[PDB]
Amino acid sequence: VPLDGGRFATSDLNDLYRRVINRNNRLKRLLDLAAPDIIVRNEKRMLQEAVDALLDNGRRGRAITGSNKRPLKSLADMIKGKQGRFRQNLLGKRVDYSGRSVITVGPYLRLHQCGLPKKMALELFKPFIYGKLELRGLATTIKAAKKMVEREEAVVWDILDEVIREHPVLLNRAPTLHRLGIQAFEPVLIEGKAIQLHPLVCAAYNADFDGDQMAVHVPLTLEAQLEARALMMSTNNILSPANGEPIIVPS
């Protein structure tokens, strides 16, 4: 691929692959020139080496890439890593329909809901809004609907409150240590840019308010909502799984 400023970038495997291609060609030539064995051997020795540096570099002397001190990343290093397969290694693959910010308090909440910024929720649920706007006929087509929320027309808030209602979200805070690290809440729209967190759940998360951030996740499919409601909901997990005593103790 090209970059800006007309400079190119490329994988290290390319430096490797050429040398194997080159040395192979140069040996085919030497067999028809009937070169002395002392030479055609040395070529073989180099090809046997260059292949090995291609597959798993490091069980030899570590052939470096052209003009660059840094070692070149081999085929084996694309599987190996820290630890094992990178994709399954932390982290771990990023995921659409998510976000985060600072969390704050809000004692006026009931325990089965949570405070999600007005500004954030708009951007998050955008495909839901595009559907409902044109379903009820307030938009002729999606391309029109797109322009409406771009205009930030006041009509959308009343639509938004419909789509938000019975749809839980998942709240997750930084080091997920036990199963209580993800819990599901019902969103209540808030003017402000902070997440509002019911104070009693702070104990389970080992959340303080020194500026910790939490993530939100939208359960998309119909299945995931009913899954999040009967298993991951706040009120369903009030006992600690380590020792049967309540974890929703007053702090």
Binding site: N42, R45, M46, E49, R60, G61
Partner: peptide
Amino acid sequence: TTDPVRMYMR
């Protein structure tokens, strides 16, 4: 690896 530079020279 008995470093290749030597055993050609030899």
